[PDB]
Design a protein around this ligand. Structure first.
Ligand SMILES: Nc1ncnc2c1ncn2[C@@H]1O[C@H](COP(=O)(O)OP(=O)(O)OP(=O)(O)O)[C@@H](O)[C@H]1O
Ligand SMILES: COCCOCCOCCOc1ccc(C(C)(C)CC(C)(C)C)cc1
Ligand SMILES: [Mg+2]
Lengths: 526, 170, 487, 124
């Protein structure tokens, strides 16, 4: 080992270097190993160079053990972390160090694919939520923002989008299995534990790794969390696999870049950020892509989270990420409080990838829902607080908004049929209160199978290997259409007669509460 | 022999998918086969219809997905995902030689209902399904009809009259 | 003769400083260092002299793994870009290195990028009209040759189809090529725009293409994106001067051209004047626009997309951009959902050449009468939804018919999408279009129904559709009469 | 850690800790961030907030107060404190002036253990 110099000064996480008498050149973004002791080492990174000979450096570990006068050795190589399929189960540190709980190296900063190395998005990424997969669908290679204030459901969307992908990737081949990478920046260290326990509970961690840069970690390590996650996703792209990549969140990542850049005396700008903080997120999100058939046809999707404050979107970072992303999702607290969860605002939420992601069975359905909700707003906005409106639009739309409310993801089969019933008027005689119980009986239970009505050869909602016929032929196809209508008609008649009659007769005190809890449980499980 | 094929951007594309097919037929497990399409794509030699059908042959004839067992495994969804990949993503359309494999699996597994969808779809696309498998499918259907296996038991159970969250098993 | 060499002395982000031993090169001069050191080729343009031998240079790529005191080659000049027929049907980055993988480009000469603007003598004060072929534009919003135009459109408003058709028409009408400039373009849209130019044959790989493409992507630093529009415009000045013809210059959002220069000025340390835009806002923007002018030798027209942050026109970036524009082609999702394509909302649009001092008198009076008509139709549309059409007088309901006819007549097809949707496209001239609207305005074509004007071009073309509609309905009557009489 | 006991940690207040270092950041020579705060605010607060956490050994049931100057939640000090909590109780002038105490806005505040499973279903 041959050194380059010795530390000269530190400003918390920041360091400075004084070159040795043997003036040796140091590259610009390499790693510097600081000799805090005889054995322990403090990794770092070059962030600027100077005329006189000096290096402003970000410290990524063992900051407290840093003292002026220490020796400083150089690697002559960029930052790189372990990479491969031997990582999907384990939380990590953006230096690759595995975090406990109770070979091949890849570069953190690689150039994104050119246009010729890409492909237009064609396949869907099922979030499990009807809202998203219908009206603002997420494709593969389709970076899509998640906005909202604190405690709206941002992390829950990106975390249910992972759980939906467990039932399938077991079934389907390991080429089309979309994996995932959660990335926590500046979040509390216990949230990572709850995510670990949750994804382990549903067997979702076999296909999902986590990158953890907590609030106690250095800003430079929070700065490189999304880069580490992306670099892990890139081999999956290059190995033909599909891969997801979440960020919770980027608004804190920008605070870290601000901290670094200001303490190293980079020129400030708006909101005290530098100029290339737009370029910061463009270095990252453009690495998301839907690759070409010359490139394995893999894909890296992105669900970057960005927290707003008082529903501001004129903020600098929000402005930037919206300018970058291929759509957006916008969650609202005024709806989160009103029992609407996930609390989207569908007008502000956009997917420029409108239909090319959707399936054959999904284009027709969601295309009807756009033509239902765009009208539902023109009617709902103008009507009073007290007007009774008996119209197919307001009826179908209100029941659809109830269906949009659900904790946790939903199987595709479950997502379609419940909406086909609404748009075609089958869910009209029911009440706005009892819509989720209708759906719970439709999907999980099977009333006509119980009540003897078996004039349906194949179409029933208990097999769950049937959606692969829906995705292929589509429900508009001649074989699935009448059987679908019959199951829904018979379910509707049996419901409206046997169940919806008993319900309204429960004019007691404890029976109504016993029912209210039932409906608010049906909302959860469905 | 083989007509020209072109990428999106117009670049010439290879058709010599020969040796990759033998690489698929030697795949002892039907997840190593899907890992060959990646190499075919990365070689500027995308898959043909015969290639996807070799993959379906191994999805049917192989015993398991990987060396170690797998939870929630299913041969059928694998095949149908190949079909949605062939038709929608790529554009190649299946043939009778493909739905044959898809139907044989539903006969072996005994899921007689989905088989009738494959029979009703092969007949909509203009394909003549083998009557051997149709007879076997109806045989499994009548078999299950005798023993009450036509539907499972947990659906025929009477519904709770009480609106208790515990009775419904939520 | 030999070439000059310099040595790096500091690296701060994209900024780099280069010591010399002789006279420093000029400003905006390009400085290359070989690809063996960084691993890839690397160009940096001088911006700011610091002393008699130092030269601050902004870097267009990533300066990672760039050691200190590395050799740095003076190109002898600034960024020389390709020019010519060989440029067409290709894509080029800021340095003119093609990124479409489609082999080299066989060019003869290679021109610099920061060309001075045309002198006042080279100008042509005579304000002319660009016959777009799109009657909606030509009537209300005549694209002035050598002028700057605004294009306001989000998603699903036919923005792509418009720019594609503009390329086609200017390629045949005025015989002039075009050029696209993606400043801060999403790299997905590069594929979705380069492939639409294959189905539309605007880029015929096995034939004659029409447009050049220049993609400065978001993954590139601002030192590149700021120097993109100069590249795409340098491609156009060859066609203006040497080929001696007219040119379009499409510019993906100028907002992202302004932001990038703001970032450069930040990195250099220049105090941001206002909200965060550089102090050199109007200078860096005007050095671009003033090259977009008519000449004695040709013309470069520029259709410029503009993003308005927070829908505020008072922000310096939009406000400075508007001071250079000449027309505003607004696009609305409302008219698009109402079947109209191109989705132009003529009343909220505007133009500068709408003056008989510039254009002929008939074209002006007809257009102003249409604006009066459609404005009155908007007012009466606010009345019909309240009162009812039967409330209106006999004079009002006539223009309520004719305004609907006009708005349906603005709907025009496109030869670009002729393969996608199947219907032909119609390149309609200027004078013929004025006689058409003058007929629909003077009432001498009122017996024709409304829907006949939907998705057609020219009064001579709709009459075939009117006859087709009448013949079809007559055949349905002759079918129903005999089907009912036979039984 | 040592005694293994349960602990209560009341703090009045976390915001003065922040501006105490803001009053020094200019003297240290650190370039100030936006509204007049130090650039290292989020990191500095995280190094303290993470120390406040239960372990296998014991449990600190901390309570924190925060000053929201001008009643502006967008101030980065409160906004950075959001992530580091489980019960983001919020108080408002509008409820206080109406004679209602504790002047809590139930819509602006939400907890973590407000789940269906952690607590009773009727409660939720
Ligand atoms: N569909 C839903 N139904 C019921 N509750 C929901 C739903 N979606 C989210 N939540 C609830 O919202 C709360 C916050 O979710 P989440 O943590 O994703 O929000 P957040 O905005 O990321 O919070 P923070 O701002 O602290 O990061 C959780 O307690 C969760 O139970
Ligand atoms: C007299 O001739 C005038 C011709 O002017 C041509 C240049 O016009 C500049 C365009 O100015 C505007 C003004 C307003 C707007 C609005 C406010 C309609 C844009 C909006 C709605 C997106 C904020 C757009 C462009
Ligand atoms: Mg969260």
């Amino acid at each position: 080992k041959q050194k380059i110099g010795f530390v000269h000064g530190i400003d918390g996480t920041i360091a400075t270097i004084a070159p040795a008498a043997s003036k040796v050149t140091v590259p610009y973004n390499t790693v510097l190993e600081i000799a805090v002791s005889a054995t322990n080492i403090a990794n770092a990174l070059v962030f600027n160079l100077e005329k006189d000979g000096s290096i402003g450096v970000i410290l990524l570990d063992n900051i407290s053990e840093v003292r002026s006068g220490q020796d400083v050795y150089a690697t002559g190589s960029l930052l790189k972390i372990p990479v491969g399929f031997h990582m999907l189960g384990k939380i990590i540190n953006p230096l690759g160090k595995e975090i406990p709980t109770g070979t091949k190296l890849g570069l953190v900063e690689e150039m994104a694919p050119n246009i010729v190395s890409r492909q237009p998005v064609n396949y869907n990424l099922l979030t499990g939520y009807k809202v998203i997969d219908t009206l603002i669908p997420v494709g593969r290679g389709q970076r899509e923002l998640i906005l909202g204030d604190r405690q709206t459901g941002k992390t829950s969307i990106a975390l249910s989008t992972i759980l939906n992908q467990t039932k399938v990737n077991n079934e389907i081949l390991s080429k089309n299995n979309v994996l995932s990478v959660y990335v926590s920046i500046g979040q509390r260290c216990s949230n990572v534990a709850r995510i670990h326990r949750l994804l382990t509970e549903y067997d979702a961690m076999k296909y999902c790794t986590i990158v953890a840069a907590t609030a106690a970690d250095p800003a430079g390590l929070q700065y490189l969390a999304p880069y580490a996650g992306t670099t892990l996703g890139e081999e999956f792209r290059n190995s033909g696999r599909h891969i997801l990549l979440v960020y919770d969140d980027l608004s804190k990542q920008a605070v870290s870049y601000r901290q670094i850049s200001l303490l190293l005396r980079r020129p400030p700008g708006r909101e005290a950020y530098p100029g290339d903080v737009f370029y910061l997120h463009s270095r990252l999100l453009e690495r998301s892509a839907m690759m070409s058939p010359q490139k394995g046809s893999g894909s890296l999707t992105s669900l970057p989270i960005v927290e707003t404050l008082s529903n501001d979107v004129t903020a600098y970072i929000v402005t930037n990420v919206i300018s970058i992303t291929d759509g957006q999702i916008y969650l609202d607290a005024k709806l989160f409080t009103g029992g609407q969860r996930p609390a989207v605002n569908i007008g502000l939420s956009v997917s420029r990838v409108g239909s090319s992601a959707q399936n054959k069975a999904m284009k027709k359905v969601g295309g009807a829902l756009k033509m239902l909700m765009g009208e539902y707003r023109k009617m709902a906005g103008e009507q009073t607080s007290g007007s009774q409106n008996v119209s197919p639009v307001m009826i179908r739309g209100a029941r659809c908004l109830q269906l949009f409310n659900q904790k946790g993801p939903s199987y595709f089969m479950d997502a379609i049929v419940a909406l086909y019933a609404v748009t075609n008027g089958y869910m009209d005689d029911v009440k706005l209160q009892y819509s989720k119980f209708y759906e719970f009986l439709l999907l999980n239970k099977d009333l006509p199978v119980l009540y003897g009505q078996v004039n349906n050869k194949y179409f029933y909602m208990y097999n769950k290997n049937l959606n692969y016929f829906i995705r292929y032929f589509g429900l508009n196809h001649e074989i699935l259409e009448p059987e679908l209508k019959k199951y829904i008609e018979i379910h509707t008649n049996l419901f409206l007669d046997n169940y919806q009659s008993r319900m309204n007769e429960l004019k007691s005190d404890e029976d109504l509460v016993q029912l209210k809890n039932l409906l608010y449980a049906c909302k959860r499980t469905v | 022999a083989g007509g020209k094929r072109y990428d999106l951007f117009g670049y010439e594309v290879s058709v010599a998918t020969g040796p990759f097919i033998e690489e698929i037929k030697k795949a002892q497990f039907y997840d190593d086969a899907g890992e060959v399409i990646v190499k075919m794509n990365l070689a500027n030699t995308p898959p043909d219809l015969q290639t996807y059908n070799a993959v379906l042959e191994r999805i049917l004839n192989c015993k398991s997905k990987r060396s170690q067992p797998v939870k929630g495994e299913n041969k059928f969804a694998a095949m149908m995902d190949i079909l949605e990949e062939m038709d929608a993503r790529s554009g190649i359309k299946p043939n009778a030689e493909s739905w044959g494999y898809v139907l044989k699996e539903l006969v072996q597994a005994g899921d007689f209902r989905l088989g009738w969808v494959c029979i009703a779809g092969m007949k909509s696309l203009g394909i003549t399904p083998d009557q051997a498998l149709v007879d076997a499918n109806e045989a499994n259907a009548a078999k299950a009809k005798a023993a009450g296996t036509d539907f499972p038991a947990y659906l025929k159970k009477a519904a709770p009259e009480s609106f208790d969250t515990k009775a419904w098993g939520i | 003769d030999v070439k000059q060499v310099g040595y790096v002395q500091q690296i701060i982000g994209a900024v780099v400083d280069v010591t010399f031993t002789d006279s420093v090169p000029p400003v905006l001069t390009a400085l290359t260092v070989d690809a063996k050191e960084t691993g890839t080729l690397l160009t940096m343009e001088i911006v700011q002299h610091l002393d008699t031998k130092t030269a601050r240079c902004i870097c267009m790529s990533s300066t990672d793994m760039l050691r200190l005191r590395t050799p740095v080659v003076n190109t002898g000049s600034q960024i020389t870009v390709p020019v010519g027929e060989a440029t067409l049907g290709r894509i080029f980055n800021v340095m003119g290195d093609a990124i479409d993988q489609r082999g080299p480009v066989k060019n003869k000469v290679r021109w610099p990028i920061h060309r001075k603007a045309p002198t006042l003598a080279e100008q042509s004060g005579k304000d002319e009209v660009l016959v777009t072929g799109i009657k909606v534009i030509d009537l209300i919003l005549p694209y002035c040759k050598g002028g700057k135009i605004g294009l306001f459109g989000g998603a699903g408003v036919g923005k792509t189809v418009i720019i594609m058709e503009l390329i086609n028409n200017v390629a045949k009408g005025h015989g002039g090529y075009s050029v696209f400039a993606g400043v801060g373009e999403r790299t997905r849209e590069g594929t979705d725009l380069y492939l639409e130019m294959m189905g539309s044959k605007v880029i015929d790989l096995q034939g004659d293409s029409k447009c050049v493409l220049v993609y400065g992507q978001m993954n590139e630093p601002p030192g590149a994106r700021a120097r993109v529009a100069q590249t795409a415009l340098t491609m156009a000045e060859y066609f203006r001067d040497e080929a001696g013809q007219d040119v379009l210059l499409f510019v993906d959002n100028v907002f992202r051209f302004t932001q990038a220069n703001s970032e450069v000025s930040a990195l250099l340390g220049r105090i941001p004047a206002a909200v965060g835009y550089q102090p050199t806002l109007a200078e860096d923007l005007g050095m671009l626009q003033e090259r977009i002018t008519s000449t004695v030798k040709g013309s470069i027209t520029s259709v410029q997309a503009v993003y308005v942050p927070a829908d505020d026109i008072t922000d310096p970036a939009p406000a400075t951009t508007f001071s250079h524009l000449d027309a505003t082609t607004v696009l609305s999702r409302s008219v698009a959902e109402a079947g109209i394509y191109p989705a132009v909302e003529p009343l909220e649009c505007a133009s500068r050449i709408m003056d008989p001092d510039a254009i002929d008198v008939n074209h002006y009076n007809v257009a102003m009468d249409i604006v009066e008509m459609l404005t009155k139709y908007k007012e009466l549309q606010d009345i019909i939804a309240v009162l009812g059409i039967d409330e209106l007088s006999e004079e009002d309901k006539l223009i309520v018919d004719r305004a609907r006819k006009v708005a349906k007549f603005m709907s025009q097809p496109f030869a670009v999408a002729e393969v996608f949707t199947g219907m032909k496209g119609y390149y309609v001239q200027l004078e013929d279009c004025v006689s058409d609207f003058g007929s629909l305005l003077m009432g001498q074509c009122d017996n024709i129904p409304e829907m006949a004007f939907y998705m057609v071009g020219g009064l001579d073309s709709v009459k075939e559709k009117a006859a087709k509609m009448a013949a079809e309905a007559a055949a349905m009557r002759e079918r129903a009469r005999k089907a009912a009489e036979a039984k």
